[PDB]
Nucleic acid binder design. Structure first.
Lengths: 195, 146, 49, 48
DNA sequence: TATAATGGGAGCTGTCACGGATG
DNA sequence: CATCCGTGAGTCGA
């Protein structure tokens, strides 16, 4: 399996990092297998199925939201039903405050559990829509979820050989002129790193 | 009891990968849960099925004739599921290797090089595992990894 | 007790005031998060080390 | 340092044939990376 | 090579003056 | 203008 020459990686300034516009810190997590790196992506196919995929992802979101609202409804039903059942038992009214707060705490957890699911499904969809070469997905689970959901759409690799692929698909001429344009721009801080 | 701060703070730490190559491997293993006694039996049952659907088609390719489209596809899935189940039993008891490789440290061979060769033994161990004997996976594995 | 023992100085009053978070749990977790990043922070794993 | 690389490089070959899980395979690859790196420049990255 | 066994372990301590990348 | 990593810091001899 391919392996990167340490002289051009750890040597400062990181020659490899400068070549692929990658961070020295981010380049680490790739080569030494701490984060996947997006190597290539079929943008056209993504586009030609973008409309349908969105519809799918949306129904999953709704189906999450639907259960949440139904699960919360049933809990509010039993919360009020128990606070009255402990009223028919003639318990102290303060002893009903422990059961009230108990329900509210439970409903809270439900909503937050459901929300974390929605937030994941949000970060999942957001990631795919704006997926492109030289992107690092350091979180594996999102990636695992990502590969299964739209694995047909992109090429995900990892390690020293993935770096090799980036170098292969690298257009030197294009990336050269792209930097000279930033040099032609007066802006100093972005001209420095482009120089 | 469970604060929102901890729930965020946990994923913040876990998502970051340490600089130590030994640590980063230790962290990766901690993901897969250890196996219950009966759970082990299941995979063993699966792999046997998977390992045998394979032995069928293997000799069939040399002789010539092949199954129909309905059979070969059903046959092929057991092959996948089997080889999938194999890769699960290894990842689970991946802790087991690291447990008794640490004892051989400081002997002119690297810890990592010890775990890996230990892993290598674990692979052979899972192939000749027999679930007919009520012995847990942990016993017949140890003798192989050592 | 922080105000009691180190209150005679204005540099400790200024320290407890610029204090980011409060809470026995939130302190241990905080120290844990800065000492060993990359490991799951239990309330019982930060109290231990 | 040479002997270190070849021992790990060879090990990787055996694992691939065995179709080892990616968790084990990737660990070897990482080791190989550091082995060649340690050979080319020791102490540069990580402890010597 | 069939009882069951399942996440490491020593860190290293008393520089110094500087350039480059980051602030 | 102040931090972090990497790289400097006399020679012969014994």
């Amino acid at each position: 399996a391919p392996v990167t020459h340490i002289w051009y990686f750890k040597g400062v300034p990181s020659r490899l990092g400068y070549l692929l516009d990658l961070a020295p810190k981010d380049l680490e997590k790739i080569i030494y297998f701490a984060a996947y790196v997006i190597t290539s992506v079929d943008e056209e196919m993504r586009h030609n199925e973008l409309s349908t995929l969105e519809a799918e992802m949306a129904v999953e979101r709704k189906a999450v939201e639907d259960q949440r609202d139904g699960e919360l409804e049933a809990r509010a039903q039993k919360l009020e039903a128990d606070l009255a059942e402990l009223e028919a038992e003639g318990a102290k009214a303060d002893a009903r405050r422990k059961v009230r707060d108990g329900g509210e705490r439970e409903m809270r957890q439900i909503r937050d559990r459901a929300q974390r699911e929605l937030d994941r499904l949000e970060d999942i969809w957001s990631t795919f829509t704006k997926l492109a070469p030289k992107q690092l997905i350091v979180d594996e689970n999102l990636y695992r979820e990502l590969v299964d959901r739209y694995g047909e759409y992109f090429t995900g690799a990892m390690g020293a050989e993935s770096i090799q692929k980036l170098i292969e698909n690298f257009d030197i001429d294009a990336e050269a002129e792209s930097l000279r344009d930033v040099i032609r721009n007066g802006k100093g801080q972005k001209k420095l790193r482009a120089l | 009891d469970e604060s929102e701060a901890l729930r965020q703070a946990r994923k913040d730490a876990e998502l970051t990968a340490s600089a130590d190559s030994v640590r980063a491997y230790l962290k990766q293993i901690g993901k897969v849960a250890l196996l219950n006694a009966e759970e082990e039996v299941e995979l063993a049952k699966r792999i046997e099925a998977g390992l045998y659907a394979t032995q069928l088609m293997t000799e069939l390719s040399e002789r010539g004739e092949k199954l129909p489209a309905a059979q070969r596809r059903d046959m092929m899935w057991i092959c996948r599921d089997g080889d999938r189940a194999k890769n699960h039993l290894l990842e689970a008891n991946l802790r087991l290797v690291v447990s008794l490789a640490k004892r051989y440290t400081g002997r002119g061979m690297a810890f990592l090089d010890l775990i890996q060769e230990g892993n290598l033994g674990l692979i052979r161990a899972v192939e000749k595992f027999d679930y007919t004997k009520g012995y847990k996976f942990s016993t017949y594995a140890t003798w192989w990894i050592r | 007790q922080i105000v009691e023992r180190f209150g005679f100085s204005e540099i400790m009053r200024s320290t407890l005031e610029k204090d980011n978070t409060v809470g026995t749990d939130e302190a241990l977790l905080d120290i844990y998060r800065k000492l060993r990043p990359g490991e799951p922070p239990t309330k019982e794993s930060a109290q231990t080390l | 340092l040479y002997r270190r690389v070849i021992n790990r490089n060879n090990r990787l070959k055996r694992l691939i044939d065995l179709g080892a899980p990616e968790i084990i395979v990737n660990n070897e690859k990482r080791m190989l990376q550091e082995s060649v790196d340690a050979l080319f420049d020791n102490g540069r990255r990580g402890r010597p």
